[PDB]
Amino acid sequence: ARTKQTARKSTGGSGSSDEDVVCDVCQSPDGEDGNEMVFCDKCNICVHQACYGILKVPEGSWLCRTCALGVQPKCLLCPKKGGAMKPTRSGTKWVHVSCALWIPEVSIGSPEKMEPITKVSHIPSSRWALVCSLCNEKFGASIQCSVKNCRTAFHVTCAFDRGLEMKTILAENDEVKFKSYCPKHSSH
Ligand SMILES: [Zn+2]
Ligand SMILES: [Zn+2]
Ligand SMILES: [Zn+2]
Ligand SMILES: [Zn+2]
Ligand SMILES: [Zn+2]
Known part of the structure; x- marks a missing residue:
């Protein structure tokens, strides 16, 4: 390839x-x-x-996966179409890999296969209740700035597309922490 x-x-x-x-x-x-x-x-x-x-x-x-199946699905967790997506356990729904990684309660299951995407139901209601400050669409789940007491919310894909600071920290046991920063608090 x-x-x-x-x-x-x-x-x-x-x-x-x-x-x-x-x-x-x-x-x-x-x-x-x-x-x-x-x-x-x-x-x-x-x-x-x-x-x-x-x-x-x-x-x-x-x-x-979506091209191999000839589908162009929406993400359960954000309003963006297209991009790297993976199916839920039963294959009926789809989620961005980035949305799945940055929303803490979502499960990837296999680190080798990066699928199925599960535990979407474990996302607390507060993430669905928030309105993304970047696109203002009352849909999907939003995360918040990692800064102390900053509660600005945004979709994961909106964060990436708008140039927000999206940080990954690698630890000794090979887990990865995923952090996000609003425009005011982004380093660049
Ligand atoms: Zn493709
Ligand atoms: Zn998404
Ligand atoms: Zn990558
Ligand atoms: Zn958004
Ligand atoms: Zn902030």
């Missing part, structure tokens, strides 16, 4: 194939050791292996 590669040829020039391409899930621009950035050959999103559950990069074509 087509992957984003960073290296320097003997011909000179840039050291990256797709310089403006980021992972659709975590928006990082770089592949990592054992963690290639793989393109979907239909919708052209690029995703880390570890962000989407790609155990091994296929030598042939690769399609994301």
Whole structure:
């Protein structure tokens, strides 16, 4: 499959194939050791292996789940269509991987496969009650700024699309903490 590669040829020039391409899930621009950035050959999103559950990069074509099934579903947790999505346990509904990761109560189940997406019902009612301060659509679940006593709310996908600071911290047991910061509190 087509992957984003960073290296320097003997011909000179840039050291990256797709310089403006980021992972659709975590928006990082770089592949990592054992963690290639793989393109979907239909919708052209690029995703880390570890962000989407790609155990091994296929030598042939690769399609994301929604393209492989020929569907364009909405996310249960936000109003955005398109992007890296995974199905619920029974296959009837779909959730953005980023929404699932950044909303704490959502479960991924298998770290290797990054699916099924479960425990959506464990999201407390307060996240559904909030109105995203970025798009103002009374739909889906919103998270809040990690700053002390800042309760500005936003969808995960809206946070990514509007340039908010979305931070991941890696700990020694290989768990990952997911933090988010409103515009006023973002570092950049
Ligand atoms: Zn990623
Ligand atoms: Zn696709
Ligand atoms: Zn979503
Ligand atoms: Zn929103
Ligand atoms: Zn804030």
